[PDB]
Amino acid sequence: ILELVPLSPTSFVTKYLPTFGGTLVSQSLLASLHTVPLNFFPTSLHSYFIKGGDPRTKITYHVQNLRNGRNFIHKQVSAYQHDKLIFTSMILFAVQ
Amino acid sequence: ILELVPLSPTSFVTKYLGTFGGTLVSQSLLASLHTVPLNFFPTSLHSYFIKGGDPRTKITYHVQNLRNGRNFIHKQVSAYQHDKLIFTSMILFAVQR
Amino acid sequence: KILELVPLSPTSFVTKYLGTFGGTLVSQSLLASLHTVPLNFFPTSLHSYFIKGGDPRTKITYHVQNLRNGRNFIHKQVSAYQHDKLIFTSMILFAVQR
Amino acid sequence: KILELVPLSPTSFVTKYLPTFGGTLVSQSLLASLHTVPLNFFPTSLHSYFIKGGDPRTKITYHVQNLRNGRNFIHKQVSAYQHDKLIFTSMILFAV
């Protein structure tokens, strides 16, 4: 139950109801890992807590490509609830 | 919940044992949350993956204070296995009032 | 004013009048993008990449490209050029307020 | 000259004149960060988050927070406050 459902190549909803910021960071990370090649790994991440909460509704994550190259990929993952941005994370990846 | 055991006001060990990544960040955030007042909540968090760890082996988290302002607390949380740095976070906190 | 752009088209703009070259590039990039979205779509984040030093003795041309729409969000890519070479890009994300 | 900051400490800066436009937020936060980074480091990217609307009839206070150092790379965060409220934050990445 950190589980996500892919609605698209870039968009994911929680399966179960959530809000702990740790859940937001973890699921946003998982989400990004499904959009990046298996040989790329996270070097850092940077999460911004924009609005709290509710555990009573689902979270939708959207992954947006910021920058890529041979050795590096940058992603942004935004989380919505009730059609409002609550949380955004930038995740940096590097190759092998 | 990913529970830690306090060894001090300021240091913590895993009680139990890229979800590993999500674990490090979570726990590092739980750790730092035990060092701040009731109405301080994270505004942002910045984690650096320094070396892969083994799950299992316990993780030890040290929480330091970095340099305050007005309306914020800047914590650094570093994670260790075998006295070697695995992971560090900067977590920023603000008050509601 | 000073950052004024002349619209060449609905998605293309150029500077009117020729440390922080950077702030200017980000600022005009944002302004350019703001001309392609409705009033109540506000920027939630931007992400700017410094690709090559500018010339402050030539024109900057900005192209706005629509990357993605979702219910609540618009994602633009703004690319800045001088002499037909890429000097700068930003990804600017917007959300509707209701 | 209008994007002029007054240092208050090694890491904190107030606007001298009245601001908010996003573009001003971004540029002031970049100038603040440039005062705290060695002269031979240059910005490679910048990532700004519009957290709450500014008012231009109020001064903005910028705080530069170190995220990570090396000999080749420096990461900084710059946060902007009005009336003791976070309105805006930026991550700036520098290379030697």
From Swiss-Prot, chain C:
Write out the annotated subcellular location. Peroxisome
Q: Could you list the residue ranges forming a coiled coil in this record? A: none
From which domain of life does this come?
Answer: Eukaryota
- Induction description: Up-regulated by oleic acid.
Which family is annotated? Belongs to the C/M/P thioester hydrolase family.
Q: What does this protein do?
A: Acyl-coenzyme A (acyl-CoA) thioesterases are a group of enzymes that catalyze the hydrolysis of acyl-CoAs to the free fatty acid and coenzyme A (CoASH), providing the potential to regulate intracellular levels of acyl-CoAs, free fatty acids and CoASH. Contributes to growth on fatty acids.
User: What protein name is recorded for this chain?
Assistant: Peroxisomal acyl-coenzyme A thioester hydrolase 1
Q: Which gene encodes it?
A: TES1
Location of this fragment in the whole protein: 13 to 118 of 349
